[PDB]
Amino acid sequence: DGFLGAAGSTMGAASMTLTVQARNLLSGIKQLQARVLAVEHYLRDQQLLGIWGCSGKLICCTNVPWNSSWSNRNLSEIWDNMTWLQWDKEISNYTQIIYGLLEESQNQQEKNEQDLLALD
Amino acid sequence: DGFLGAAGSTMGAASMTLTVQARNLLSGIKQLQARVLAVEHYLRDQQLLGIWGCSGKLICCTNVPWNSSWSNRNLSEIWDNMTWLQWDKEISNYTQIIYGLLEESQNQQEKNEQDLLALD
């Protein structure tokens, strides 16, 4: 489908077209300012992914466990009976905590790898 | 700690907060020009890391040996008895050589991997 065609699709189906939305983020002083701001926001999202250990990835698995209090729904209800727009609302109050946990777990992983490589 | 809080910390302690400084690099024609220049410099640093084989990493180990003439201090003096501000001065005359060596070793690694993958 096309840009945002999956907006009404379930999460487990909508994830099939992540590339379609990813490619549409980069594609008269006010307009130049808007373009510079769009570039800065793109780079902020790429930096945020980079500091989590997710570089050239659209789907990236991490080692942060789900704490249940964020959302205690069954896995099949989240992926088969929900859209991404609804999910973005259910956990809108927990994204800062998750982001902090991801940053800390990446710092621990990078330090452990640096030490592991030293074993001659 | 906060932004640059580790500036007076030792290198082996200051390295614990690299994320804190990394996140503060992206966060009226003169101001727009300053913003564009800041974006270009950020991208130049990311490209420089990319050509060394260090993409989504804050700490990245390489295969370039230390030549001693750059600095002949004991490892424990550098990491426990020095700050990053002092270290940046001790080897300020050798960073171009190190960068060239890193670029060459990455070129050799990429070519060797390309040939290694060809062994059916």
């Epitope: 640096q114 030293a118 | 490892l75 990491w79």
Partner: antibody, heavy 123, light 106 residues
Amino acid sequence: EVQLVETGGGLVQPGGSLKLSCRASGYTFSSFAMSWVRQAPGKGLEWVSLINDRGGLTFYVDSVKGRFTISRDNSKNTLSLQMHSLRDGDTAVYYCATGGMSSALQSSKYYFDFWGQGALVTV
Amino acid sequence: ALTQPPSVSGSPGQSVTISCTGTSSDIGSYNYVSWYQQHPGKAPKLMIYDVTQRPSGVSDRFSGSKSGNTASLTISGLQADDEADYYCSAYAGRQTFYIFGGGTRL
């Protein structure tokens, strides 16, 4: 001034479990990797397990990879080892030792620097 | 494991060497061959670390060397208080961290 004090168990039968613990003093606990070394009553020394200074990287001798868990608490200055199954061949003195690894920014070790006196574990 | 003589001895005032042998993948690859002195009834203490380096506080009579796949601990100026079970150990890579030999009774 460096001291490692074992506070282990006694006799268990095969299929059970026993937890050993060591207390450290005289040095910064979090600055050194620590390990366990086993000595059967009539044999020489062998390495059993190694834990790094942060308690994030653990290594085991093949004979115990599926049986022993090594952990540490850097706020308590406590090292502990949870041993399962404990077969007849595991009767030995278990010593805590400081050394055996260095976390990349420290000089090389690859040796056991300090030793405790050892807990006696029997089966 | 490394191979060591089962017993090395001599009279006080003399000197001995205690050998330690292995293979080319461990003792002959990594220059981390340490020696321990275990008095009967006591835990071992470190005598030599690295290959030829001595810890501070240990008498200058204990020294050593390595060549090929053979390491040697040299004990000069033998005293009556040096009777102990001596052990060698070495680093053997990331899979097998440390390998110990058998004890040598002085």
